[PDB]
């Protein structure tokens, strides 16, 4: 006999297929390679970055923690498994009481004494109904589930390292742009100086020029700080100072990652890490019902051993001192104040809770992937659209640039051209990044990179 | 006896009445209707949204979770309650040992044997001092508390759903604004294209006219994305794909809720969910001192049973095999290494912790409501004040619109009109939301939606 | 014996010294006083704020909690100490059974009875291999750790309060700047009203002049709200409404704190709080291996007591009734299905996990200080460079101010002067703050304020 019920994974309560239209590309359908099976070494192309992932994996503690965390639950599974088996031991015991008149067999105050040394168990429970096999399962699951959770955690170390490198490099490009426009700003302000002591530039076109230059001298220092902060942001996730012998790193403008299929939603149910932890996490608690159930049932204890006894010590390892005990026991509950029903329910409930929980994780995937397909299905278009506000403004730069020094126009159109452009340059870089984020997190949500390499069928 | 001490709820260590002045309206005083008793189906007027709340209730797993949680702690209370009662059962046991000479009663190796099937309890505790009623109350409390926390949770589900539907609708409204100003922008650029190949529009006035249009073409894509992101944001909290047959949903510009009375601070204590869990939480640990105390006291144990025995199996259910046992026990400790003291302390402290925690939650309510009263007491004012920067800009738009195509002026003052307007438009939508937000959160803070309906004394 | 392994604090896996260069000042080297040893009543110079810290110390509930927690862990340690010691009790027990023929000593149904009242211990474990001592140390450690963590959390209450006071004052300075430029803006608009009903000011120059004043009347209400929100932010951390009798608080422009030495990283290991909790946290589980080891070894039980007994109650405290027992026992397991291996692993692992955690905490310290040194090594320069964009913009304000009313120029170069100035003003305050922030947090990460006073050598 064994009392665990029939696992029956619930039906994923999200839409059968991802929603569409209002920013969503076409639904490619069943993918022949899941993102899950697509290794980040492939999905990331930037090899200097790739080898940063390398270093983060082999170093980041929070992943270590999450790795050991498994070794624990295997160990905890072990301990549970043992309890199917009987605890055998060598054991010596004494006893040496005075009794009173009415008690000693002598009818008068005497002092009994028993000694024994033996090899056997006390109170071994003989799983007939599998109260134990159940428990063993609970912890087996809670183990397996932990395995998953580890996988779940790496994909996130990867993603977060991608991301960090990116805000780092991105902020690096947010910087050099500031260098260029610093030399530019100051050269501009110096040609509105000779031209001032020469009266051609007024004090207004001089103060303006000063607000440009100063407007830059500030966003210099900022994208300096936010460079070091992004650097610090990195070595952490690394667990190692960044090595010197890094490969040649690329630049945001490139094409750094593979475009990844989004498959069906149902796909998740066999591939998204946490969503499996969830499942086993559920499974364990289902076991815990079996365990509960069995407490309604006859438990068969068994004490038993064998060795040598006597009345004084001395005659222990001497002839005939041989002894032994056989002491089985069958017990069965007739009244607890529904204690049993009560803590059977607690367990059934806890199942249900984990059912619910499975369902929450699932329904959170849909969300997190959809957000990334909105993002996929919008960011490209925003990338062309902002690419234009660069050109239009670089021309609307050159033209006003010359037109100011040509007496036709003022400085306010020179200046405002500079805003209308610089803004478009920063926001450009940043837009690039967040398209990247969007894709990296998208990579994750569909199964991320447990795999270094890509694998098939 | 029962050594649980006298609960004496502390005094809510915040200001007596909500602070005033620097952005706070008038303090209406005791409200005849607590926001608490005011049901969201009333406090929300948008019936489409209302019914979304409905769906999010019947569906969200996170609530399911938190709801079961109760049931668990009920069962947990059950389990503790059964402990007052004796654990009764059928029970069979054997024993069958060889003894050595000095130990068998025959003075010579013989083999004893005892068999017994009885119906009784072992070491049942009589609750005299109420160590057990104590635990029972601890568990009852951690249960009741858990009821509260469920209520707390739902209010946050409501609030968060209102909010989602909102930023969703607010980004919907953020969008059509960009449809409009897209057709507007391109119309404008094309009337600065005929006018270009015709020489009336320069190349500058063609490149600015290109950056307005371009600056739009991207804020299109963005508010196209941040719409699917907010959509995705919804079905989650829904736990269900949004049904088709929803009523007619309204628009931010309306008047979607009931203004809510802010009542007195004192009011929180009897109505704001979490602030009760806190209390009961505190109360649970209060009992847990009772418990500790009692282990200083005489504990009464009791083993007792009756049925048949014998010296070989067979003669069990036969005549005279009748047996029984009565075996009472009294224990009173006269030395642990101050164990009982130290472990009493723990539970005392733990009460104190929960007192402190009660106080925390109280003082966090004050804050979170007051923030909503600065919010109430300024958002309307920023709503009129921003309503103006729309009109003044729409005029400073019609004007410069004509004035540019009338050759009096340039394009820079057409463009800057466009900025200084569209800016005020978006900022207006967002300021609408944030006012709303602030009010939903305010609703919550004062006792939120437990009740679908609004109920009287 | 004592099987607790030999603690060996791992080597702090970060860079030997603070990263340098791309925004980092000079690395002053070992500091003669750690930021740790330096007092916040000295590091902070605003004495009004200083007494805000005083207030938030003597009150804040979250720190209280955090403090009680210690006491509880002392208590828990206590209880674990006690187990070295034997559990002594006065104790009474009875027994009264009807046997059947073959079992009664009378060969025919009769009813036995035994009574006793004795002062002793049962099953006291003699700590030989120090399994218990081990545990004692475990809970001692986890206690000591809890001590550190408390200190940890105080530094953070300070930091959070410095902060809230700041963003408070910073938002106040953000406000009066708005009062000023409101009287300014309305004056301006009315001088472009007399001049409008007089023809000199156009209708465009009146709608621009209307969107300035309207852009201000708006940013009034906002910075009015985010001051009551930054107020509510404060009394919370305070745990008390802000006293009337505070001293004279300063203004962001001052020099409110002591610049602090950032010493060697190594210094962290001996001074930054959480990094210690972790260490002890590590040490605790270190002991936990000792404890596990020992279960491989013989355990030595000892039931033992003394008193008076008899066969009927009566002759209890009557002559001869004297009795006693001595009943020692040694046990050594020979087989558990690897249970002891497994549960030894779990404990070994749990050490290694705490190793990992020590390492991660250290590695987050680096990060959080480096960020503060980028910050320290940039904010000064962004402060001079933003100081300039103020002057350049107030000049480029006075100029265009007179120049507009002197007919030479339009209003757009009055308005854009106003933007390019006021924006520089707001962002100037904000920048002041974020520098301050960066510096408070810096002071925290390197030991923060345990000490009100500064101590040395
Ligand atoms: C679930 O009840 C499975 C068993 C029922 C089938 C037949 C009976 C077999 C078990 C009898 C138990 C007695 C022997 C146990 C001694 C240790
Ligand atoms: C706290 O317990 C104070 C009272 C003293 C208790 C001492 C022991 C005597 C109690 C007698 C109770 C009889 C009740 C019978 C059970 C149904
Ligand atoms: C851990 O408990 C290991 C157990 C082994 C202990 C060894 C016992 C040795 C006994 C001799 C001690 C006599 C002391 C005289 C010294 C001069």
């Amino acid at each position: 006999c064994s009392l665990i019920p029939d696992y029956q994974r619930p039906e994923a309560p999200v839409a059968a297929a991802y929603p569409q239209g209002q920013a969503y590309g076409q639904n490619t359908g069943a993918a022949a390679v899941p993102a899950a099976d697509i290794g980040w070494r492939e999905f990331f192309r930037d090899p200097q970055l790739q080898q940063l992932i390398g270093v983060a994996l082999e170093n980041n503690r929070d992943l270590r923690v999450a790795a050991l965390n498994v070794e624990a639950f295997r160990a905890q599974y072990r301990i549970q498994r043992a309890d199917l088996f009987p605890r055998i031991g060598v054991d010596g015991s004494g006893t040496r009481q005075r009794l009173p008149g009415d008690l000693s067999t002598t009818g008068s105050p005497a002092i009994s004494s028993q000694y024994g040394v033996t090899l056997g168990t006390t109170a071994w429970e003989l799983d007939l109904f599998g109260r134990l096999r159940s428990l063993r399962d609970q912890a087996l699951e809670q183990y397996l589930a932990t395995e998953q959770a580890q996988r779940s955690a790496q994909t996130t170390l990867v993603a977060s390292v991608a991301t960090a490198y990116l805000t780092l490099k991105a902020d690096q490009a947010q910087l050099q742009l500031t260098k260029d426009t610093l030399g530019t700003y100051q050269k501009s302000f110096d040609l509105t100086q000779r031209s001032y002591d020469v009266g051609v530039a007024s004090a207004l076109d001089l103060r303006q020029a000063q607000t440009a230059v100063e407007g830059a001298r500030a966003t210099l220092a900022q994208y300096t700080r936010l460079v070091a902060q992004d650097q610090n942001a990195l070595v952490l996730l690394l667990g190692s100072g960044i090595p010197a012998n890094l490969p040649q790193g690329l630049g945001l403008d490139q094409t750094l990652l593979t475009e990844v299929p989004a498959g069906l939603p149902s796909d998740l149910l066999q591939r998204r890490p946490d969503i499996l932890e969830a499942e086993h996490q559920l499974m364990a608690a289902n076991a815990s019902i079996g365990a509960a159930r069995a407490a309604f049932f006859p438990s068969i204890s068994l004490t038993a051993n064998a060795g040598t006894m006597s009345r004084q010590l001395s005659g222990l390892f001497d002839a005939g001192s041989g002894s032994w005990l056989f002491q089985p026991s069958i017990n069965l509950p007739i009244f607890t104040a529904g204690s049993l029903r009560a803590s059977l329910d607690y367990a059934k409930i806890q199942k249900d809770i984990n059912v619910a929980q499975y369902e929450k994780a699932i329904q959170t995937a849909f969300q997190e992937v959809a957000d990334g397909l909105a993002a996929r299905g919008t960011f490209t278009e925003q990338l062309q659209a902002q690419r234009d506000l660069v050109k239009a403004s670089d021309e609307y730069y050159q033209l006003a640039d010359k037109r100011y020094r040509t007496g036709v126009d003022n400085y306010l159109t020179l200046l405002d051209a500079q805003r209308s452009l610089f803004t478009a340059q920063q926001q450009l870089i940043t837009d690039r990044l967040n398209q990247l984020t969007s894709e990296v997190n998208l990579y994750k949500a569909l199964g991320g990179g447990w795999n270094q390499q890509t694998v098939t069928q």
Side-chain angles (χ1 to χ4, degrees), chain A residues 7 9-10 12-14 18 144-145 148-149 151-153 155 264-283 354-369 444-447:
Chain A
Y7 174 47
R9 179 193 255 172
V14 312
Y18 303 79
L144 238 65
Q148 290 306 303
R151 247 161 246 182
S152 153
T155 68
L264 282 211
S266 332
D267 265 8
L268 305 179
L269 290 198
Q270 294 259 322
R271 291 162 184 292
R272 187 182 217 277
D274 35 36
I275 240 163
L276 315 176
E277 177 214 316
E279 184 176 74
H280 298 172
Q281 271 265 278
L282 167 81
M283 308 184 100
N354 285 273
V355 164
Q357 297 211 259
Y358 193 51
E359 305 204 312
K360 192 209 191 180
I362 281 188
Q363 293 187 155
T364 298
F366 214 59
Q367 195 271 100
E368 266 160 25
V369 179
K444 177 187 192 181
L446 293 167

Side-chain angles (χ1 to χ4, degrees), chain A residues 95-162:
Chain A
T95 304
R96 201 173 158 132
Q97 42 187 340
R98 169 159 133 217
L99 300 174
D102 42 351
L103 294 189
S104 52
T105 85
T106 74
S108 38
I111 305 132
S112 87
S113 160
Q114 210 165 330
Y115 294 56
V117 165
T118 152
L119 171 95
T121 317
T122 121
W124 178 27
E125 178 169 285
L126 298 174
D127 221 12
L128 183 83
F129 290 123
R131 180 195 98 81
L132 272 270
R133 294 164 257 153
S134 305
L135 284 180
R136 203 203 38 198
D137 279 27
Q138 195 203 283
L140 164 102
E141 224 69 79
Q142 297 175 198
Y143 163 70
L144 238 65
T146 285
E147 233 168 59
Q148 290 306 303
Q150 204 231 273
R151 247 161 246 182
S152 153
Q154 173 173 323
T155 68
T156 311
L157 184 73
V158 152
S160 296
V161 166

Side-chain angles (χ1 to χ4, degrees), chain A residues 59-73 146 149-150 153:
Chain A
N59 262 277
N60 165 285
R61 307 304 176 267
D62 217 3
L63 181 78
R64 289 197 187 181
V65 149
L68 312 201
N69 249 11
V70 183
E71 263 217 80
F73 280 84
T146 285
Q150 204 231 273

Side-chain angles (χ1 to χ4, degrees), chain A residues 194-455:
Chain A
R194 324 190 194 284
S195 170
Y196 174 75
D197 295 344
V198 150
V200 185
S202 42
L204 196 87
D205 300 348
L206 184 74
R207 285 310 170 175
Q208 284 177 283
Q210 202 180 301
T211 71
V213 166
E214 295 324 285
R217 232 157 255 181
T219 301
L220 184 67
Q222 157 175 285
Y223 283 152
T224 311
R225 179 163 68 259
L226 304 191
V227 147
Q229 281 191 334
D230 299 7
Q231 292 176 256
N232 307 331
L234 200 51
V235 184
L236 180 70
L237 323 191
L238 298 192
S240 163
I242 330 171
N245 46 341
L246 330 157
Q248 173 78 33
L250 332 189
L252 296 194
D253 54 14
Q254 302 286 72
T255 318
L256 324 165
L257 359 151
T258 289
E259 210 254 35
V260 199
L264 282 211
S266 332
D267 265 8
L268 305 179
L269 290 198
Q270 294 259 322
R271 291 162 184 292
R272 187 182 217 277
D274 35 36
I275 240 163
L276 315 176
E277 177 214 316
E279 184 176 74
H280 298 172
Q281 271 265 278
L282 167 81
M283 308 184 100
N286 175 71
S288 173
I289 280 122
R293 250 193 187 201
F296 296 8
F297 272 57
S299 180
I300 297 190
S301 183
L302 169 47
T303 312
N305 64 79
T308 101
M309 324 182 72
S310 127
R311 201 167 59 140
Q312 28 161 35
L313 193 154
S314 4
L316 287 163
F317 305 159
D318 304 321
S321 72
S323 69
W324 82 30
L325 168 53
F326 183 99
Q327 197 187 75
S329 301
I330 306 189
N331 182 286
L332 176 51
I334 309 307
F335 170 78
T336 72
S339 174
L340 290 192
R341 197 175 186 262
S343 197
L344 166 120
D345 278 49
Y346 174 105
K348 279 178 167 180
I349 295 174
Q350 295 268 132
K351 160 180 170 150
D352 291 32
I353 279 179
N354 285 273
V355 164
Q357 297 211 259
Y358 193 51
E359 305 204 312
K360 192 209 191 180
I362 281 188
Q363 293 187 155
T364 298
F366 214 59
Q367 195 271 100
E368 266 160 25
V369 179
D371 266 22
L373 287 191
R376 183 167 274 183
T378 46
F379 258 108
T380 277
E381 262 42 44
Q382 197 180 323
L383 293 213
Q384 63 180 60
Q386 176 80 10
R387 268 180 82 133
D388 292 326
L389 185 67
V390 176
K391 266 151 191 168
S393 272
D394 165 68
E395 317 273 56
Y396 174 54
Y397 174 51
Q398 293 171 314
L399 320 191
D401 185 30
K402 313 185 192 56
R403 173 159 313 194
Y404 165 67
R405 36 180 171 86
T406 311
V408 209
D409 240 282
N410 338 308
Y411 197 104
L412 195 86
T413 329
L414 180 80
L415 214 48
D416 188 274
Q418 311 171 300
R419 302 161 181 167
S420 274
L421 178 49
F422 196 40
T423 270
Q425 310 186 282
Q426 283 176 66
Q427 175 77 333
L428 162 44
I429 284 185
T430 277
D431 280 20
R432 163 59 160 182
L433 183 100
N434 299 29
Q435 164 196 76
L436 300 200
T437 275
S438 297
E439 292 340 280
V440 160
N441 294 348
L442 200 54
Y443 178 56
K444 177 187 192 181
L446 293 167
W450 155 227
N451 326 270
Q452 179 185 12
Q453 312 298 328
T454 302
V455 211

